[PDB]
Design a protein around this ligand. Sequence first.
Ligand SMILES: OC[C@H]1O[C@H](O[C@H]2[C@H](O)[C@@H](O)[C@@H](O[C@H]3[C@H](O)[C@@H](O)[C@@H](O)O[C@@H]3CO)O[C@@H]2CO)[C@H](O)[C@@H](O)[C@@H]1O
Ligand SMILES: OC[C@H]1O[C@H](O[C@H]2[C@H](O)[C@@H](O)[C@@H](O[C@H]3[C@H](O)[C@@H](O)[C@@H](O)O[C@@H]3CO)O[C@@H]2CO)[C@H](O)[C@@H](O)[C@@H]1O
Ligand SMILES: OC[C@H]1O[C@H](O[C@H]2[C@H](O)[C@@H](O)[C@@H](O[C@H]3[C@H](O)[C@@H](O)[C@@H](O)O[C@@H]3CO)O[C@@H]2CO)[C@H](O)[C@@H](O)[C@@H]1O
Ligand SMILES: [Ca+2]
Ligand SMILES: [Cl-]
Ligand SMILES: [Cl-]
Ligand SMILES: [Cl-]
Ligand SMILES: [Cl-]
Ligand SMILES: [Cl-]
Ligand SMILES: [Cl-]
Ligand SMILES: [Cl-]
Length: 650
Amino acid sequence: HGTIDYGDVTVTGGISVFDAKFDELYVYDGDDLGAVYAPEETRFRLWAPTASEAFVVLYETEDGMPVKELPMKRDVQGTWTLTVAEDCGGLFYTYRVKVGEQWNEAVDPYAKAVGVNGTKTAILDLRSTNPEGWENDQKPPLASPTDAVIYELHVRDLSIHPQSGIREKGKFLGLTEEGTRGPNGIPTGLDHITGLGVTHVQLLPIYDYSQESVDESRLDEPHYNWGYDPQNYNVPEGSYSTDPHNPAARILELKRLIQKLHARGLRVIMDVVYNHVYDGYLIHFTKLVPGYYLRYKADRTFSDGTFCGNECASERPIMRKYIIESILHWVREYHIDGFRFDLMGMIDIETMNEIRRRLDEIDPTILTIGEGWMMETVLPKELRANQDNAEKLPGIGMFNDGMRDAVKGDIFIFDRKGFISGGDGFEDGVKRGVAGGINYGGQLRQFAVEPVQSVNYVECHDNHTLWDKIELSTPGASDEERRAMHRLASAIVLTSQGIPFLHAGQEFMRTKGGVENSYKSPIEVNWLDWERCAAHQDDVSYMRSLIALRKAHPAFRLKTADEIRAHLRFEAAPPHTVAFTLRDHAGGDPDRHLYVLYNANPGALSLELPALGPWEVRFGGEHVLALEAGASGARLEVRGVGVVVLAVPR
Ligand SMILES: OC[C@H]1O[C@H](O[C@H]2[C@H](O)[C@@H](O)[C@@H](O[C@H]3[C@H](O)[C@@H](O)[C@@H](O)O[C@@H]3CO)O[C@@H]2CO)[C@H](O)[C@@H](O)[C@@H]1O
Ligand SMILES: OC[C@H]1O[C@H](O[C@H]2[C@H](O)[C@@H](O)[C@@H](O[C@H]3[C@H](O)[C@@H](O)[C@@H](O)O[C@@H]3CO)O[C@@H]2CO)[C@H](O)[C@@H](O)[C@@H]1O
Ligand SMILES: OC[C@H]1O[C@H](O[C@H]2[C@H](O)[C@@H](O)[C@@H](O[C@H]3[C@H](O)[C@@H](O)[C@@H](O)O[C@@H]3CO)O[C@@H]2CO)[C@H](O)[C@@H](O)[C@@H]1O
Ligand SMILES: [Ca+2]
Ligand SMILES: [Cl-]
Ligand SMILES: [Cl-]
Ligand SMILES: [Cl-]
Ligand SMILES: [Cl-]
Ligand SMILES: [Cl-]
Ligand SMILES: [Cl-]
Ligand SMILES: [Cl-]
């Protein structure tokens, strides 16, 4: 890891990079950080206020020796500039700076293209990376965040199974392939996903993550990583391209992916990890401006609230600028439709609200959701963008972990049951999530002001899959009983207020063989198992029908807490069940009233229904023995674990 030299403070008037007054100097406000290429000339601008000298080092090959090094000129607000009056297309470059007595060399933090494994910046005209028709790329319409159905997917998982029927296995382009077929001729890949009716694909890290995670020069050897180890924030990951050595390939191919998804009616959410970098000692930030971009404790060690070694100092002005401009680059250059913020509670509220404001100026339908977990850091508590501060973060969704644990049981105590598996006392937790996590009334309240702030889920890339958690908590159960519990959990997600979130393969009861944290497990653990999918086409059709049910009923998709408090009523129901009505054409629903029963009781039950008119079955008729509407008391005869939905027609 070597020596870190924080600078000769006389360069900065005696003001140390750790000093509070440093944030008031060198606040560069320009739009031109990085390299601006043209055949005529390339202009470079680097922010490096503590350096006493700065150089652009040019390379002809990603692996070669320097062919030239050119001094930069100290410019305004701690920046350095250089323009090369030659056509620099096809060259690579780094910056070399002298900070204190140290000479450090680093990739441009604003790199838009890189060589293999991201060790040099690549110079190219990004307009040459646009797919044909990119100008006319248009997004599918989205009227509300509550209208999204998110499908969380890893690019390698999608296609790497040997029977996926996809040619470019493990690559961005594998998700562009239409008409792919798996075992028994079932649809796979893109056709499987569009056939589900989901609206957004949320991609696990597609920015460039570190060579230590996946070596982009050894792709002919087994490899796998989720990618939560950021190296170059503004360029795609090389291993997802057909040629990691061609700087343009990963860019063009990611754009081809996004274009195809948009044409097939899907939006794309990027999982972004601005809370930490792969290695706080080796990252370009620390080589170029040591001590500025990462968070330090009072004793000048890294704050490590992420448990990854370091935290990005989002609250300092140039890093806030970096993050915002990075997000805007993904929106503008790649047409991205949303962001999921890893460990969002490590990011400060001012930065998050500024991101949301800048995105709203461009397209307010762009989604922003994040992990709003309460986690210690040197960042003061009142500035953490987490659930405790959700009232200060309007428009930003957060994963509802209270709902998640109430439905399927505690994710950290593997054997513990929850609502679906017959545990006691989880009804109110489910009800809190049904209401979108808002302050609904009495003890039914969570962190959300508005339901657009609550993301509902029972599975994601983290922790056991829903199937694997059910198996660990239901030792006495048959696989048939477990499948019924699994289906019930998915139904709760898709009929709760807020934003529904599905893990890729949840539709076929995805298993990881009991592996809890699969971030670097082999492909045999992590792939989308299209054989299992082919054996679970009934369960896939069930998920498709649930998604269609939510689409048909805007009562499930209410945009405001005021609507939920006016139209949602919880009904009397026995233990191990939850029952509620969505009354009076909620949200523009075509039917007059809906009644929803979550039944976790495997036996027979006779339930009193609200006398709201001639109820008829809309979903889950397989559980309904009889339905009596009374004068039009009203009563429902049910058996077995699952969801039942009734409606009073207009
Ligand atoms: O190499 C540094 C770091 O690697 C390992 O941490 C990994 C986690 O084990 C893994 O689960 C994943 O964690 C991320 C979550 O998936 C994500 O949704 C969110 O909760 O943030 C987490 C971090 O971004 O990825 C990390 C990083 O690769 C290892 O366990 C650590 O001990 C180690 O310090
Ligand atoms: O080494 C760090 C850690 O990273 C990963 O842990 C993540 C959890 O897997 C993930 O569920 C989430 O944990 C949060 C709970 O979901 C939430 O209900 C509440 O309790 O806050 C938790 C975070 O404090 O995020 C963590 C942290 O990234 C990885 O899976 C672990 O193996 C690993 O230890
Ligand atoms: O579409 C409304 C309908 O959705 C749900 O029914 C699904 C079943 O739960 C699911 O198992 C599957 O069942 C069908 C099989 O795919 C098929 O091979 C054959 O056996 O017919 C079955 C239908 O009886 O697909 C259906 C439809 O997706 C939900 O359970 C119903 O309550 C609801 O009416
Ligand atoms: Ca990489
Ligand atoms: Cl670097
Ligand atoms: Cl199809
Ligand atoms: Cl690969
Ligand atoms: Cl580190
Ligand atoms: Cl906190
Ligand atoms: Cl809560
Ligand atoms: Cl219906």
